[PDB]
Amino acid sequence: ELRVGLEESELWLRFKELTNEMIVTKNGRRMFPVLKVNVSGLDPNAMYSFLLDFVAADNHRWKYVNGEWVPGGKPEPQAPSCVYIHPDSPNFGAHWMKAPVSFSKVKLTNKLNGGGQIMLNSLHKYEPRIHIVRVGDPQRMITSHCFPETQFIAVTAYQNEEITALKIKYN
Ligand SMILES: CCN(CC)c1cccc(O)c1
């Protein structure tokens, strides 16, 4: 049975309880924490690609007011459907299952300035989502897992001084 489990869920839940924030820049910023998953129940012999995209959680944007995140207005038009291909793709199930899969090089940005970066809208909440694509498959089978522990608000600068402090502490 295919199981994709979140690594360092306790680390994520510490950010989530403050409301997690990720910096977006012109040139793209790496995530902290990095999304990491363990995989079991792939066909070790088969080849797969691993994809990561970011699903918009709400039909409104967010604002940090009086040390509280609150609904902050109507959403902007959905960000372009950007997909990041794990650099180990394509690869054997055995490869994906032998060690955690880390999305350490993915970069979040607020400008379509190329370079395999993911465009997000400032002050919108996103949920990371991993896709396993079997290669050479005439049915193009894909599996999708969402990671609710890893939800964050995209920000051009940290709003919550506790998040700024956690990011320095655990990084
Ligand atoms: C947040 C909990 N804490 C100790 C369990 C921790 C700190 C850093 C990395 C990590 O995987 C965990």
Swiss-Prot record:
Subcellular compartments: Nucleus
Transmembrane segments: none
DNA-binding region ranges: 11-171
Tissue-specificity statement: Detected in testis, but not in other, normal tissues. Detected in lung tumors (at protein level).
Pathological association: Neural tube defects: Congenital malformations of the central nervous system and adjacent structures related to defective neural tube closure during the first trimester of pregnancy. Failure of neural tube closure can occur at any level of the embryonic axis. Common NTD forms include anencephaly, myelomeningocele and spina bifida, which result from the failure of fusion in the cranial and spinal region of the neural tube. NTDs have a multifactorial etiology encompassing both genetic and environmental components. Chordoma: Rare, clinically malignant tumors derived from notochordal remnants. They occur along the length of the spinal axis, predominantly in the sphenooccipital, vertebral and sacrococcygeal regions. They are characterized by slow growth, local destruction of bone, extension into adjacent soft tissues and rarely, distant metastatic spread.
Function: Involved in the transcriptional regulation of genes required for mesoderm formation and differentiation. Binds to a palindromic T site 5'-TTCACACCTAGGTGTGAA-3' DNA sequence and activates gene transcription when bound to such a site.
Assembly behavior: Monomer.
Protein's recorded name: T-box transcription factor T
Organism per entry: Homo sapiens
Classification of source organism: Eukaryota, Metazoa, Chordata, Craniata, Vertebrata
